Amino acid sequence: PARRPFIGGNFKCNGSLDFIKSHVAAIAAHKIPDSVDVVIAPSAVHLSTAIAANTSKQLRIAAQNVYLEGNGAWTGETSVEMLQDMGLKHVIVGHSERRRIMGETDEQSAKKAKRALEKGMTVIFCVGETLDERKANRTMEVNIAQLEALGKELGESKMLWKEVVIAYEPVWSIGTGVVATPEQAEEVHVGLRKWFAEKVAAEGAQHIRIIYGGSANGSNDEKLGQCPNIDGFLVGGASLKPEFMTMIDILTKT
Amino acid sequence: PARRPFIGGNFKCNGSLDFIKSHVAAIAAHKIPDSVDVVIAPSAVHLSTAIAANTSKQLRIAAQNVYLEGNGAWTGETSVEMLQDMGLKHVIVGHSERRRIMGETDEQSAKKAKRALEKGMTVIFCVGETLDERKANRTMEVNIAQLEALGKELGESKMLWKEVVIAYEPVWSIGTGVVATPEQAEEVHVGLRKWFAEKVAAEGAQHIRIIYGGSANGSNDEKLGQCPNIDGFLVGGASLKPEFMTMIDILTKT
């Protein structure tokens, strides 16, 4: 049973018009196969610019964040319809930064993802646990509660999980001084697909994509691809460098 | 003690690319004097596009929000550096929608204005109280507090107030169509300028631009402008309508 390899690029709060132009062009030129999905998430101010630079059939732009309200009195916010009007398919939801740093609740992350999913978008729905929580031993407790909020919000319409790519962020290895082992990452991915099968759809638990946003590198990734329940990567800082193309290359070979 | 009149328009989380082009060009095609400061805030997604539609030499584009950190791991967050790279001089800060709905603290809003102010942006700082607060009679107290948090962050560099525009938006007034009588609108501006001379500076107070926000509209706008301490308007709903251009004519004539 094969799921489709999927790699995301998260630029976060990085870039200028020129860097978008030069970087997007860089990735676009890299030969991208059709067995693989490649997405990059530029900052909102750069969506229009990145999209002009994308001369690629294969690659597509995503957005880092969106709101749980349609167009309205929501200053400082983007809506799904603004995204779709610009021709965007993918958006990132639940990133650790917005959850952990910016006070974004599981409900807001789940409410946000559902809304987008209703309208046909693919959501990179991001979940992960911090070191305190790993140490508590609630690795599963924390991730599943993040996931369960999505199950609850999607609810009856479980068709929507189809457009969800799970992103596991090993937040506890982000300069905690602790790095992840491919074993530890895989163990989590197995544990999550187990939840989805057991509590959503056993049939569709083999079709969902779960990617490892966990300090994946040019190396230590050829290993990570090998992990069977790891379906690809959500790169962060490295998505701003040419290392990113190489990471793409690995996914294909693996 | 003459203040240069300032009218700002907030699209809020509204717009389509096509809409943005057409409207921005309808505004640019309007005769704007060198006497009045005009600024419009489209969504971050539409910033590039709005700047391209803008053929005016007086009109400026603004941002409805900015983050309090710089470039880096703030997924879903825009930075002043991104803004200035795009050629933006104005950003909106401390809007009741984000304050009263999304949980932006007073200091969160204060640290955003300061950082954007340090890098020489002209900040549209928003203050305002809820229907309750006004009834509890806590108007000046609330407006002062939101205003104080900026003082605290600014601290020694008090001149960063020079490029501050203050928008008092009654919380009750906004959207509910119910609005502030000129007697009322003016009442608040005196207290706020009272605060500024009192707490900040007595020469700079003469020059700080306090603009009135909320349900501003034709006919009504007219007396509102005549109020000698109301230096302009922050428009939401009508900024989207051809009405906005009319509003600028009134502001100047006044």
Numbering used by the authors:
A (entry chain O), B (entry chain P): 2 to 255
Tell me, in the authors' exact words, what the paper reports.
TIM is a ubiquitous glycolytic enzyme whose active site and overall α8/β8 barrel domain structure are highly conserved; even so, structural differences in its interface region have been used to achieve specific inhibition of enzymes in parasites. Since Giardia lacks oxidative phosphorylation and depends on glycolysis as its major ATP source, it has been proposed that disrupting this pathway could hinder the survival of the parasite; therefore, glycolytic enzymes have been considered potential pharmacological targets. C222 is at the end of loop 7, with its lateral chain positioned in a hydrophobic pocket formed mainly by carbon atoms of residues N218, G219, E223, F234, M248, and I251.
The most severe changes in the Ki values were when negatively and positively charged residues were introduced; for the C222D mutant, an 83-fold increase in the Ki was observed. On the other hand, the C222DC mutant produced triclinic crystals with a P1 symmetry that contains 10 dimers per asymmetric unit. WTC and C222NC produced high-resolution structures (1.6Å and 1.45Å, respectively), whereas C222DC was solved at a resolution of 2.7Å. The C222DC structure had an empty active site, which is consistent with the binding data that indicate the low affinity of C222D for 2-PG. The crystal structure of C222DC provided a clear atomic description of the structural changes induced by modification of C222 that explain the observed detrimental effects on GlTIM. In this structure, it is relevant that the 20 monomers of the asymmetric unit display structural variations in two specific and localized regions of the protein. The structural alignment of all monomers showed that loop 6 (residues 175 to 182) and loop 7 (residues 214 to 221) exhibit a clear heterogeneity of conformational states, which is evidenced in the per residue α-carbon RMSD values of all chains. In regard to loop 7 it is important to highlight that even though slight conformational changes in this loop had been previously noted in response to ligand binding, the relatively large conformational differences of loop 7 in the C222DC structure has not been previously observed; its main chain atoms move as far as 2.7 Å from their original position.
